[PDB]
Amino acid sequence: MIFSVKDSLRQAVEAASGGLCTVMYTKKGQPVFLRRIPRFNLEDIDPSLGTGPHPAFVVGGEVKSEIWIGQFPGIVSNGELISVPGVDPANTINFDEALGYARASGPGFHLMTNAEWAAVALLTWKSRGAGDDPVRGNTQWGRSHEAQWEAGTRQSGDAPGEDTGAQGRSGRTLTGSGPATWRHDGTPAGIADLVGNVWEWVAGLRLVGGEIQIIPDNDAAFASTDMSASSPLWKAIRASDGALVSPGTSGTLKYDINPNKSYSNDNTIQDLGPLTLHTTTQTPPAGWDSNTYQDYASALYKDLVVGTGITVPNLLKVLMLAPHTTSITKGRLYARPYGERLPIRGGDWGNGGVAGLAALYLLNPRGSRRWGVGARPAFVL
Ligand SMILES: [Ca+2]
Ligand SMILES: [Ca+2]
């Protein structure tokens, strides 16, 4: 027999997808549906963003031909974070668990990185008309908040659109079970559920007391790179020239609450004004750290407030940390400028226009486990 069930499935997936998708197999021989996104240059999105390959395609100094994105939200099976259709998306796992489960699959496999997310979002935006966020999804308890008649299959068994939070029933939908408009390119061969269903942990991005920090390029792809809190790998961004510099340096970019507002230590949560990007951080009340869940600051991605002196470096636009267009009317940005925060992207079933390609939620610490937050695998090489 030259024939295997596992290889024949791979071929079927490759065929049906015009060669855009495949199935790779994990260390433990489990299926990972993956969609290829070939390398593009920044100038192909908009020449005013700079030049060279998008960071998603640079791993350990080497420029890659393409990357592979998990076609579906990850699910944890045995001890691997795999990517398959028709299942309840992984949830209630923290950043380190997600990062680990992703790597367990073997060489190449990793927790999808902020650089990859950034690559897909920008490419999606440009390729679908360079207008708004082209993509929809499970952003209202099973269906799309923009489009009621687009729904997936709810794991809960409840009707799309029914808020069952109080009954402790989730609004997650089985992966890819929504229509093709819930896939990044409008076709069945697209990446599914990027927008909605569950938020997803991404690697290579971090907040420390409001200072923005990243793992350079797509270096977050290695199974060896230290993304713990103590890691010397994290770099900040200089705002004046956008160079990668050591954390704590003078002119580094930070997410901050609004200049026209102030932290209220009333043990009561307030959204403190349009989120602002400048080089300083308002001092929070004493004793507020990564385990403090209090006041924050949000803003629609298009509406992020740029500091009076600041020219936002292209680097931030490319990694989807600051808007480049304002044609984007969905996707909300959240940030707590105190403690260590790890990013989750895309939005879930209960957000609304908050969900979207540009949705970024930096209010939680790496330890947080929530029923509407999960992860998905990617592969390079
Ligand atoms: Ca999602
Ligand atoms: Ca407060």
Count of positions (residues) in the chain: 381
| Cα–Cα distance measured from residue 344 to residue 94, given in angstroms and rounded to the nearest whole number | 10
In 3D, which of 334, 338, 376, 352 has the Cα closest to residue 114? 376
In sequence order, what are the residues at sequence separation of 6 or more whose Cβ sits closer than 8 angstroms to the Cβ of residue 225?
A: 215, 219, 231, 233
| Cα–Cα distance measured from residue 225 to residue 281, given in angstroms and rounded to the nearest whole number | 28
d(CA 265, ligand 2 centre) in Å:
5
d(CA 345, ligand 1 centre) in Å:
7
Task: Give the ligand whose atoms come closest to the C-alpha of residue 89.
Answer: 1
d(CA 199, ligand 1 centre) in Å:
5
Residue 362 bridge partners (DSSP): 335
d(CA 209, ligand 2 centre) in Å:
17
8 Å CB contact between 50 and 318: yes
| Cα–Cα distance measured from residue 279 to residue 320, given in angstroms and rounded to the nearest whole number | 18
User: How many domains, the chain?
Assistant: 1
| Cα–Cα distance measured from residue 190 to residue 182, given in angstroms and rounded to the nearest whole number | 8
d(CA 363, ligand 2 centre) in Å:
14
d(CA 282, ligand 2 centre) in Å:
14
Structure determined via: X-ray
Q: CA angle, corner 319, sides to 34 and 250, nearest 5?
A: 145
Classify residue 256 as exposed, middle or buried by CB count within 10 Å of its CB (0-12, 13-18, 19+).
buried
Q: Report the Cα–Cα distance between both ends of the chain, in Å, rounded.
A: 28
Looking only at the bridges linking them, the beta strands covering 109-111 and 377-379 are: antiparallel
Task: Give the ligand whose atoms come closest to the C-alpha of residue 268.
Answer: 2
In 3D, which of 124, 100, 126, 104 has the Cα closest to residue 181? 124
| Cα–Cα distance measured from residue 138 to residue 144, given in angstroms and rounded to the nearest whole number | 5
Residue 192 has a CB neighbour count (10 Å cut-off) of: 29
Query: Tokens 């380190």, residue?
Result: 96
In sequence order, what are the residues at sequence separation of 6 or more whose Cβ sits closer than 8 angstroms to the Cβ of residue 61?
A: none
DSSP type of residue 279: S
d(CA 195, ligand 1 centre) in Å:
4
8 Å CB contact between 276 and 305: yes
In sequence order, what are the residues at sequence separation of 6 or more whose Cβ sits closer than 8 angstroms to the Cβ of residue 127?
A: 185
Region of 26 (left: φ > 0; alpha: ψ -120 to 50; beta: rest) is: beta
d(CA 270, ligand 2 centre) in Å:
5
3-state secondary structure 69-112: EECCCCEEECCEEEECCCCCCCCCCCHHHHHHHHHCCCCCEEEC
Task: Give the ligand whose atoms come closest to the C-alpha of residue 257.
Answer: 2
d(CA 118, ligand 2 centre) in Å:
32
d(CA 244, ligand 1 centre) in Å:
29
Task: Provide the 3-class DSSP secondary structure of residue 118.
Answer: helix
Task: Provide the 3-class DSSP secondary structure of residue 333.
Answer: strand
Residue 340 bridge partners (DSSP): 208
Looking only at the bridges linking them, the beta strands covering 205-208 and 80-82 are: unpaired
8 Å CB contact between 330 and 353: yes
DSSP type of residue 59: E
d(CA 72, ligand 1 centre) in Å:
9
Give the resolution in Å: 2.8
d(CA 268, ligand 2 centre) in Å:
4
Checking 38-41 for CB contacts under 8 A at 24+ apart, the result is 38/65, 38/66, 39/63, 39/64, 39/65, 39/66, 39/67, 40/119, 40/123
Q: CA angle, corner 39, sides to 36 and 41, nearest 5?
A: 150
- Range(s) of the domain holding residue 57: 2-381
Task: Give the CA distances from residue 265 to residues 27, 275, 294, 333, in Å, rounded to whole numbers and listed in that order.
Answer: 50, 19, 8, 23
d(CA 357, ligand 2 centre) in Å:
29
Task: Give the residue ranges of DSSP H helices in the chain.
Answer: 5-16, 42-45, 95-103, 114-127, 314-318
Task: Give the CA distances from residue 138 to residues 191, 233, 270, 354, in Å, rounded to whole numbers and listed in that order.
Answer: 14, 35, 27, 12
Task: Give the ligand whose atoms come closest to the C-alpha of residue 73.
Answer: 1
| Cα–Cα distance measured from residue 195 to residue 173, given in angstroms and rounded to the nearest whole number | 12
Sheet holding 109-111, edge to edge: 21-25, 31-38, 66-70, 377-379, 109-111
Task: Give the CA distances from residue 113 to residues 77, 193, 269, 304, in Å, rounded to whole numbers and listed in that order.
Answer: 21, 16, 30, 22
d(CA 355, ligand 1 centre) in Å:
8
Looking only at the bridges linking them, the beta strands covering 332-335 and 360-362 are: parallel
| Cα–Cα distance measured from residue 337 to residue 50, given in angstroms and rounded to the nearest whole number | 29
Task: Give the ligand whose atoms come closest to the C-alpha of residue 360.
Answer: 1
